[PDB]
Design a protein around this ligand. Structure first.
Ligand SMILES: [Cl-]
Ligand SMILES: [Cl-]
Ligand SMILES: [Mg+2]
Ligand SMILES: [Mg+2]
Ligand SMILES: [Mg+2]
Ligand SMILES: [Mg+2]
Ligand SMILES: [Mg+2]
Ligand SMILES: [Mg+2]
Lengths: 234, 9, 234, 9
């Protein structure tokens, strides 16, 4: 790996600089280098890894959606324009799949198997669900097996989070938020999505009294997104 | 249009 | 070149798709491929080339400025933190210089020498001035020779534009705008900057009566930027 | 802060 010669601490320092510079492809490469040193990640380092790859795949998803919309219009009255729209959508799609496969590969070699604390294990299993979900968004061929891989990862995370974390924990909240989005947007299960969002929101509301002012702010920010999706879905 | 997922902190 | 096997028309089609997808590194690579087919560019194709590289170098300049500001703070009371800020600023700087050298190389091989009409020749010489100006922003070692290369390109463009184009022509206006920015931001010549902006603005104002509604809109958009800089500078 | 140069059309 091109980051094999750089100190772990230097990779983490440069990931933070790349975040400030909005250089998210560099940030992801630094954090991949840090993971490949083979030590477990701290909470802050897990968040850096998540920010970097979410920003890289976020640009790819946005581009893929623009190209897929143009390609769908072309397949309606529509003037034949040749293979270029499909080719370019395929190029972006292949790069998106590559980024997802890289994140899944880090989780499988060896972040998940070394993660024993609930906070780290739920974080990594939610990430596994997320990057299978991004694969599912573009899948048309193993679409079923990719959707099942996402569901299985989210379900293992949910089972640990419900046993080990309070209902206001931000990791637990964001896992439930993303699993609800899986149900609505991927799995054709809007009623499961709405039920999960509502139960998550209500159980968190009932535990807010236990929190400090700063924890309250962290939890309520995510609860607002559950409420924003419930307003969209109903 | 699309559902909101967990954002970066 | 990786674009050597793709049709010229297909490269231009895919540049337009990449612009819609906000994939400006892809857009630049497609347009570089199109230039390397060896045919002259149309007005629309010159604009695609300019948009693509301006967006790529624009991200690099923004990142370089963030990193240079952190590096300058570190060289003030400031805790030693090692070589990482300098190394990462240097990495971004080298990639920025590479992008500028690639655009300058296209202009020299062979866009400028084949450009005989005033609109194409002034466009390419303004671009040559611009990409030497971006090199000058990061230069600290040949800084003088880089500043002279920018000035010489802008001056040749100015001499053709004043002979061959009306004072409202948008290419002529944007050349004068960018040369005024060279004078203020690079050449330590604020009075030359202010004089050029004012004379450009006033000569354009006097020729607006000749224009259609749509030409009037094109020219006045650029004139507003001359006025915005004059408000900043005075 | 910095002067405005010609934008994309
Ligand atoms: Cl392609
Ligand atoms: Cl570096
Ligand atoms: Mg070491
Ligand atoms: Mg027709
Ligand atoms: Mg495919
Ligand atoms: Mg051909
Ligand atoms: Mg100290
Ligand atoms: Mg250097």
């Amino acid at each position: 790996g091109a980051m094999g010669s750089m100190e772990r601490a230097s990779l983490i320092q440069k990931a933070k600089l790349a975040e400030q510079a909005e250089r998210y492809e560099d940030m992801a490469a630094f954090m991949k280098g840090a993971v490949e040193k083979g030590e477990e990640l701290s909470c802050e380092e897990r968040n850096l890894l998540s920010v970097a790859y979410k920003n890289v795949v976020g640009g790819q998803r946005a581009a893929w959606r623009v190209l897929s919309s143009i390609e769908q219009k072309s397949n309606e009255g529509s003037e034949e324009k040749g293979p270029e729209v499909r080719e370019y959508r395929e190029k972006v799609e292949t790069e998106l799949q590559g980024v997802c496969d890289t994140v899944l590969g880090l989780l499988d070699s060896h972040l998940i198997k070394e993660a024993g604390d609930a906070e780290s294990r739920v974080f990594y299993l939610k990430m596994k669900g997320d990057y299978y979900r991004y694969l599912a968004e573009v899948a048309t061929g193993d679409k079923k097996r990719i959707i099942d891989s996402a569901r299985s990862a989210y379900q293992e995370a949910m089972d640990i989070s419900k046993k080990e974390m309070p209902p206001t924990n931000p990791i637990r909240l964001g896992l439930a938020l993303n699993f609800s989005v899986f149900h609505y947007e991927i799995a054709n299960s809007p009623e499961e999505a709405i039920s999960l969002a509502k139960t998550t929101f209500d159980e968190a509301m009932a535990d807010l009294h236990t929190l400090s002012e700063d924890s309250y702010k962290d939890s309520t920010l995510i609860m607002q997104l559950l409420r924003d999706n419930l307003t969209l879905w109903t | 249009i699309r559902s909101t997922s967990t954002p970066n902190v």
